[PDB]
Amino acid sequence: LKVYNSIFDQAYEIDPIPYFNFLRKHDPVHYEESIDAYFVSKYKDVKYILKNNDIFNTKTLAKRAEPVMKDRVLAQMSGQEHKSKKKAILKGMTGKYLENLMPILEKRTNDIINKHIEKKEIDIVNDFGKVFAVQSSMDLLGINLENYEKIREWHNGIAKFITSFNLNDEEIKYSLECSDKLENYLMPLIKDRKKSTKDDLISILLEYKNDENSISDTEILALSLNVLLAATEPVDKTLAYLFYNLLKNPEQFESVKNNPKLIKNAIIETLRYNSPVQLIPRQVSKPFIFNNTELQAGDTVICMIGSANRDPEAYSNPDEFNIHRSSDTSHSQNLSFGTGVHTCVGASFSLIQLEMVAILLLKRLKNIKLKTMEITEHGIYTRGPKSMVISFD
Ligand code: HEM
Ligand SMILES: COc1ccc2[nH]c3c(c2c1)CCNC3
Numbered sequence: 102l103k104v105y106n107s108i109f110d111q112a113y114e115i116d117p118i119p120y121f122n123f124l125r126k127h128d129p130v131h132y133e134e135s136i137d138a139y140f141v142s143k144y145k146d147v148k149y150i151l152k153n154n155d156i157f158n159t160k161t162l163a164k165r166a167e168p169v170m171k172d173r174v175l176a177q178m179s180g181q182e183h184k185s186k187k188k189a190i191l192k193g194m195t196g197k198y199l200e201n202l203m204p205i206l207e208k209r210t211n212d213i214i215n216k217h218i219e220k221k222e223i224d225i226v227n228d229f230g231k232v233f234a235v236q237s238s239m240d241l242l243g244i245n246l247e248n249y250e251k252i253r254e255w256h257n258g259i260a261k262f263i264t265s266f267n268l269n270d271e272e273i274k275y276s277l278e279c280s281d282k283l284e285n286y287l288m289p290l291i292k293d294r295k296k297s298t299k300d301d302l303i304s305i306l307l308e309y310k311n312d313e314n315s316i317s318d319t320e321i322l323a324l325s326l327n328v329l330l331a332a333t334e335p336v337d338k339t340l341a342y343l344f345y346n347l348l349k350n351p352e353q354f355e356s357v358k359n360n361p362k363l364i365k366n367a368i369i370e371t372l373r374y375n376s377p378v379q380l381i382p383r384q385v386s387k388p389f390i391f392n393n394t395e396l397q398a399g400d401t402v403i404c405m406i407g408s409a410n411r412d413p414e415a416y417s418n419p420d421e422f423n424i425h426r427s428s429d430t431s432h433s434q435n436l437s438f439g440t441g442v443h444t445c446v447g448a449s450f451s452l453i454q455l456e457m458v459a460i461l462l463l464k465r466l467k468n469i470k471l472k473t474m475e476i477t478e479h480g481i482y483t484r485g486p487k488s489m490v491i492s493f494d
Contacts, residue, residue, distance in 0.1 A: 108133055108140055109266075114481055118420060121408035130394035130402075136266050138382070138401035139394070144412035144433065146391050147404040150383055152441040154179070157383035159443065161401055165382070169259045169280040172323030176443050182311070187446050189309045190328065193302030194241060194450040201300060202240060206454060209236045210461050218465070222472060225344055225489040229462075230337025237454060238332040242325055243301025244290060251286075255279040256333055263330065264482035283329075284322060291318055291325070302328060332447055338377035338485030339368070339455060341476075344462070345489050346371055346422045348471040353424050361460060367424040368455050372437035374422045376407040380482045381439060407484070410435050466493035 106123055107113070108131075113120050124131050124142040131140045141147055150157045159176045166174060175187055192198065213232055217223040235253050236246055244252070258279025262268065268276070291303060295318075298304045306321045347354040347367060357363045381404040389396045396402065411419040415433035416426070426432050438445035445451070463469070469491050476486040 104128065104131070107135075108481065109135055114479065117407065117481070118411070121405065121411055124405070125408060125412060130391045130396070136401075138403050139396065140403050140405055141391070142405045142408035142412075144409040144415040144436070147381075147406070147409040147436055148440060150402060150404055151381065151436070151439055151443070154442040156386055156389060157402060158386055159383065161382045161384045166263050167323075169262045169276055170323045170326050171280065171284055172317070172319045174323055174327040175446070176327075179442075183442070185311065186309070186316075186324070189305050190302065190324070191446050193305050194447060198300065198302070198305075199450065199453070203453070203457065205240050206237050206457060207461070209233055209240065210458050211465075214461065214465050221494070222490055222492040223466070225341045225462075225491060226337055226486055227488060230340045233340075233458065234333045234336035235329075237336065238329050241302055241332060241450075242328060243294065243299055243303045244287070248286065252283075252329075255283045256329060259283065259326070260330055260334055260483075264334075264480065266482075280326075283326065287322055287325060288318065291321055328447075331445075332451075334483050335377040335451070336455070338483065339371055339375075339451075340458060341486045341489035342375040342377070343368055343371040343455070343459060344469070344491060345471070345473070345476055345486065346374065347424075348469070348491070350422055353422075357424070358463065361463075363424060364456050364459050365452060366426075368452055368459070369435065370422060370424045370426060373410045373416075373435035375485075376410050376435075376437045377483060377485055378437065379405065379407045379480070379484050381406060404436075406436050406439075410437060466491070469493050 106120060106128075108120070121142060124140065129141065129143045129146060131142065132138075133140060141150060162174065162176050167177070175183065175190065178186060194202065210233060213229050217228055223229055231253065235256060236249060239246060239249065239252060256279075258276045261272065262276035265272070291307070294301075294303045295307055298308065303321070303325060306316070306324055309316060347357060353367070357367055383402050383404070385396045385398055385400040385402060387398050409415070413419050415431065417431040434440075438448040470493070472490040472492050473486070473488055476489060478484055478486055
């Protein structure tokens with residue numbers, strides 16, 4: 102039976118919401134032959150997939166990412182190893198490490214603001230988010246900001262490899278060249294940190310011990326690259342989406358201005374409404390069936406986080422932005438950080454960092470007005486506005 106609606110239609114990337122509605126209603130487990138994978142659109146099926154790491158495993162991430170990551174990433178691990186190494190990464194963004202980091206992130210934020218405050222406008226995507234996001238990631242890791250701009254360039258190249266389907270011969274080579282340059286820059290710093298242990302995540306990874314057993318330097322590089330990629334991408338997107346959605350709903354923007362504590366809920370609702378990480382793949386380990394769609398071992402399923410997060414079975418009026426949602430007619434925990442074993446280790450830090458930035462932008466940019474009246478969004482795997490310019494006094 103031929104199907105005519107395709108994730109890879111040009112219309113989908115422009116506006117995927119009609120596709121989410123169609124797929125959830127008429128094809129919740131939808132086959133795409135161009136990448137030999139099934140797309141899963143409903144909240145309850147995505148949740149089930151992500152909660153069942155034994156049936157739907159993370160082995161698909163060994164060729165979609167490992168070629169550029171140089172070694173095993175966290176998502177490829179399991180058992181005590183995954184648990185202990187995930188805890189090590191969390192350590193770098195909790196406790197005293199978090200206390201130390203946040204003032205630095207405040208400095209990053211105000212320095213960017215100060216560069217733009219006299220121009221009376223700023224592009225939350227291109228002026229703020231893309232700069233802050235990589236700087237924050239480098240501060241978290243302990244990489245000094247001198248070669249910051251080249252770090253951005255390479256990051257973009259590796260990201261493209263991981264977030265893209267059916268890359269051509271020349272795109273693959275550039276992504277790998279970016280991976281090598283990043284490897285060539287970062288390895289000496291790991292070697293230096295090996296002797297000069299600092300209070301950063303790189304040092305944590307060097308100090309880690311699996312029973313008097315350290316992890317190879319190339320293992321630390323991949324995990325460091327895993328953190329750089331993981332933390333940078335979603336930050337610019339979410340910040341842009343947050344202020345866009347608030348300014349498009351002036352009542353809610355004012356509520357946030359009058360009650361700063363509502364900022365957390367606005368970020369959460371932004372993550373639900375405009376999920377910046379859109380797709381999460383898994384590999385099927387054994388015959389399985391959702392609705393009446395049969396899956397075989399070896400098949401690939403791709404969870405559609407944005408679709409799930411707008412499922413009317415999980416949220417009332419799911420396609421409306423409302424920072425005042427709560428479970429106290431229908432509300433659920435959003436899947437924007439995933440769920441189960443591989444739930445985003447950086448979830449709490451992300452909410453803290455985004456609230457810090459939002460509060461400073463709201464403090465320092467007075468009488469914010471929207472200038473980008475209508476956004477253009479790009480990306481199907483990770484996804485955000487091209488530009489989001491605001492004006493201010
Ligand atoms: C708004 C910001 C972010 C969002 C929306 C986001 C989204 C996600 C999602 C959806 C997953 C699950 C992927 C899967 O199940 O395969 C994930 C995992 C992960 N995220 Fe994030 N993330 C964010 C920020 C960060 C930050 C700041 C870091 C590092 C500091 C980070 C590091 C990770 C890691 C290491 C994993 C893998 C966890 C595991 O395998 O156990 N993320 N993230
Ligand atoms: C750069 O492109 C990607 C591709 C897959 C990804 N998965 C996760 C992130 C990410 C970024 C960021 C946060 N952690 C989960």
